[PDB]
């Protein structure tokens, strides 16, 4: 009944070392601790993924390359472009150990769910959904979401993956493109030039997986009410058509107002309504993080969502803690949306929803 929280001090220190999000893991954990939420959870130490575990998805050649460049942090290896290492995914010293740690944490959370230790297991430092079997991408070196789904598959016949990160969950969608046993649903910004460039509403998967990929392309400036209306509409239809046995939910906070990417205009309350809708299904649920580049806001978001999972109302005042001085200028838990336009036209959203409904008739 009590949610599992994947945590150890060593794991947070490892996750803190990614240069695209330095110290973020510590900020998220410190805020959760400051609100005393960890006392309401079952704290489980993550295992480190073995080569065999990582190889359930990633190719041997890619894993061996990552291991090789990780030794000295060789960021100029002849084969690195081929393997997606470069500006977004640099070959830093020890990056293999980092990858193995996050892969292992999501696998540990999935195992907790299989064993019935909990109905909800949380790995806020996971969710690296862009990585491909043989290629790093989008700050992701190992696709822990795919590894977690593959572990859950041992017990759960149909798994629903829901991806609320700002960016299209392309690595997870591609991994499961050809199967009807895992349905992927991504809501994301979709615009020419915007990473990774995929995920139009017409992208529905392939072969036996046709219609078991769902993409909801959204324009800039979306706020809580409209986002929740879209998310609820799609998830209601998906749940009815697909009848999942377990859910993996990626909650990247790069949609939240104040993110330097400045694309969506969401608050944690809106994402929380989506989370509540999914929790009401009462299925085994693996909760992951993902993007989020305003570090204090990402901690605000994931702390608030941890409160949602626990059914608790948190104080609006950020408690004093290690990183309190980073919570200005308001020092409150709530995030105020920016005063910019929502570029989502109601007719286009209607069209997208109609198209998705038509696709889901084939799953039914």
């Amino acid at each position: 009944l009590v949610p599992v929280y994947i945590y150890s001090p060593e794991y947070v220190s490892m996750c803190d070392s990614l240069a695209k999000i330095p110290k973020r893991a510590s900020m998220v954990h410190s805020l959760i601790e400051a609100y005393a939420l960890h006392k309401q959870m079952r704290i489980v130490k993550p295992k480190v993924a073995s080569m065999e575990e990582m190889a359930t998805f990633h190719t041997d050649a890619y894993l061996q390359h990552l291991q090789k460049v990780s030794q000295e942090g060789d960021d100029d290896h002849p084969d690195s472009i081929e393997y997606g290492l470069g500006y977004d995914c640099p070959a830093t010293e020890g990056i293999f150990d980092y990858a193995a740690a996050i892969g292992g944490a999501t696998i540990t959370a999935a195992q907790c769910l299989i064993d019935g230790m909990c109905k909800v297991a949380i790995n806020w430092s996971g969710g690296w959904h862009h990585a491909k079997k043989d290629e790093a991408s989008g700050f992701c070196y190992l696709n822990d979401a795919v590894l977690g789904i593959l572990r859950l598959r041992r017990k759960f016949e149909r798994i629903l993956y829901v991806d609320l990160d700002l960016h299209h969950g392309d690595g997870v969608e591609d991994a499961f493109s050809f199967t009807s046993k895992v349905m992927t649903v991504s809501l994301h910004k979709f615009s020419p030039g915007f990473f990774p460039g995929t995920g139009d509403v017409s992208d529905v998967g392939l072969g036996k997986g046709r219609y078991y990929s769902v993409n909801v392309p959204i324009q800039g400036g979306i706020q809580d009410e409209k986002y929740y209306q879209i998310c609820e509409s799609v998830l209601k239809e998906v749940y009815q058509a697909f009848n999942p046995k377990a859910v993996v939910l990626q909650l990247g906070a790069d949609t939240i107002a104040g993110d330097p990417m400045c694309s969506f205009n969401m608050t944690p309350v809106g994402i929380g309504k989506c989370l509540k809708y999914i929790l009401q299904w009462q299925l085994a649920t693996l909760i992951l993080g993902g993007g989020g580049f305003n570090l204090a806001n990402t901690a605000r978001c994931w702390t608030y969502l941890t409160g949602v999972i626990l059914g608790k109302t948190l104080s609006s005042e950020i408690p004093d803690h290690e990183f309190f001085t980073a919570y200005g200028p308001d020092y409150v838990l709530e995030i105020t949306p920016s005063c910019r336009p929502d570029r989502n036209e109601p007719h286009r959203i209607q069209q997208i929803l109609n198209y998705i409904k038509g696709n889901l008739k084939h799953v039914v």
């Binding site: 500006y87 977004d88 915007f194």
Partner: peptide
């Protein structure tokens, strides 16, 4: 290939 970032 797009850049993220």
């Amino acid at each position: 290939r797009h850049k993220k970032x």
